Design a protein around this ligand. Structure first.
Ligand SMILES: CCCCCCCC/C=C/CCCCCCCC(=O)OC[C@H](O)CO
Ligand SMILES: CCCCCCCC/C=C\CCCCCCCC(=O)OC[C@H](O)CO
Ligand SMILES: C[As](C)(=O)[O-]
Length: 431
């Protein structure tokens, strides 16, 4: 339970030692697709891709369960009640269960209409429906992993998470071949290999692990706020796609190229965020508010610094890199212009995004959502409209408008994260 350096140590050492294992775990996740497509190399079943969004709303909900778990457990530990702690796992599991039932049941009955809003059946439907159904069979297990992730992240034991992750990636590496060759299962088999990978992780956790509406409310409010924030981010990407497409179809193709890469650059900040939840949550429970504030700015210093480097790499690399990805030069031009304009905003995203983690850690999701709304909606939409339409800038106007929310939100974070009477009162009420 202790997690050395938590209450008295160097915050940089503390956050890094926690965030680095978490980052390794995140790299394992990528290997799945690499191994999958490597073995898929040996037009009908390929509507598996149609069902891809469903897998992502499952990780999204699992993620909300994780932070609810992480947030609540880490405050209990810091308060030194391994008391509410065993309660929390219980309530964590029960919440995960009902979420799986509601999702499988509404999944099933509304299956037909839901699938319509994804893809067209002139060729792929029966393939689509089967995979949708197999996806439903994975829900409880995915939710279970959220609980477990939330359990070991709350206790600050990330090595168990990093080792679970590695075991999962090895399993998928070995099984993918066996499903193709021994069992003759095709694409289904690589999917099933990925899934037995996830269960072996689940197994690893439980084996390691061997040896009152108020509390549903506390868990549900943080956890569901996390889901609401995924949503807002997804919606902001929709409104962005809407504008890009109606202006120039090539800019929409450019974004399709930049997206995975823009996402990797941001991952080191997601790793630090996870570490910060534990440190804020536990120091908050222990009553040390100053240290939680120092913890946030230690995290911003790490995250900003790393992402700025990855961002600058992207910008200078883009002119040489993107032409290799496409022969249409309007598409590689748009991708280069987008990166050049928006890339430096990325490290600034750390300021408001870590601010969101802090409020989740201390049980105040309202300000988590406030900062996410401020970043992806309240500023961006009206400013993009202003710059891309009224002022006659077009795609260049989208790029500038869209990143203006990141700056305002960074301003907000900076103002809110500091000693205040209310913040100190909040900690009095907590302990
Ligand atoms: C969780 C991550 C949140 C970060 C989001 C802030 C984006 C600012 C810079 C990103 C440039 C790289 C991607 C370029 C296209 C991003 C589209 C986008 O983020 O749009 C923001 C706003 O919602 C418009 O409507
Ligand atoms: C454009 C908005 C920029 C955001 C400002 C960053 C604030 C960081 C200041 C140091 C805090 C140390 C106390
Ligand atoms: C109304 As209050 C407890 O957020 O100051």
């Amino acid at each position: 339970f202790t997690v050395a350096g938590m209450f008295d140590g160097s915050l940089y050492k503390l956050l890094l030692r926690m965030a680095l294992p978490m980052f390794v775990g995140m790299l394992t996740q990528v290997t799945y697709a690499i191994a999958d497509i490597f073995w898929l190399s040996h037009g009908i079943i390929a509507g598996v891709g149609l069902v891809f969004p469903v897998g992502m709303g499952l990780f999204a909900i699992a993620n909300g369960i994780q932070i609810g778990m992480g947030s609540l457990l880490s405050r209990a530990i810091g308060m030194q009640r391994l008391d509410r702690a065993q309660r929390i796992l219980s309530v964590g599991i029960i919440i995960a269960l009902f979420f799986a039932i509601v999702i499988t049941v509404l999944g099933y009955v509304y299956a037909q209409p839901l699938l319509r809003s994804l893809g067209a059946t002139k060729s792929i439907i029966g393939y689509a429906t089967e995979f949708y159904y197999y996806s439903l069979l994975t829900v409880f297990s995915i939710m279970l992993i959220g609980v477990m992730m939330g359990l070991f992240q709350g206790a600050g034991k990330i090595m168990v998470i990093m080792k679970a992750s590695l075991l999962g990636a090895l399993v998928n590496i070995m099984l993918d071949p066996i499903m193709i060759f021994v069992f003759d299962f095709g694409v289904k088999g690589v999917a099933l290999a990925s899934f037995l990978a996830q269960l072996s992780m689940v197994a690893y956790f439980i084996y390691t692990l061997m040896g009152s509406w108020k509390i549903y409310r506390e868990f549900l409010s943080v956890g569901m706020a996390q889901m609401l924030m995924q949503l807002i981010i997804a919606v902001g990407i929709v409104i962005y796609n809407f504008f890009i497409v109606r202006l120039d179809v090539n800019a929409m193709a450019a974004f399709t190229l930049t997206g995975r890469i823009d996402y990797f650059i941001i991952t080191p900040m997601l790793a630090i965020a996870t570490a910060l939840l534990t440190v804020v949550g536990q120091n908050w429970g222990h009553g040390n508010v100053t240290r939680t504030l120092n913890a946030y700015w230690a995290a911003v210093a790490l995250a900003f610094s790393i992402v700025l480097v990855l961002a600058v790499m992207h910008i200078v690399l883009a002119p040489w890199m993107y032409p290799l990805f496409t022969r249409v030069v309007a598409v590689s031009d748009y991708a280069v212009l987008q990166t050049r304009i928006m890339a430096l905003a990325l490290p600034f995203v750390a300021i408001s995004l870590l601010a969101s983690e802090y409020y989740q850690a201390i049980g105040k999701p309202w300000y988590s959502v406030l900062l996410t709304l401020m970043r992806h909606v309240f500023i961006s939409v009206p400013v993009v409209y202003l710059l891309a339409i009224v002022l006659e800038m077009r795609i260049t106007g989208v790029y500038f408008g869209a990143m203006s929310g990141t700056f305002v939100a960074a301003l907000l974070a900076w103002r809110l994260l500091r000693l205040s009477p209310r913040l100190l009162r909040w900690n009095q009420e907590a302990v």
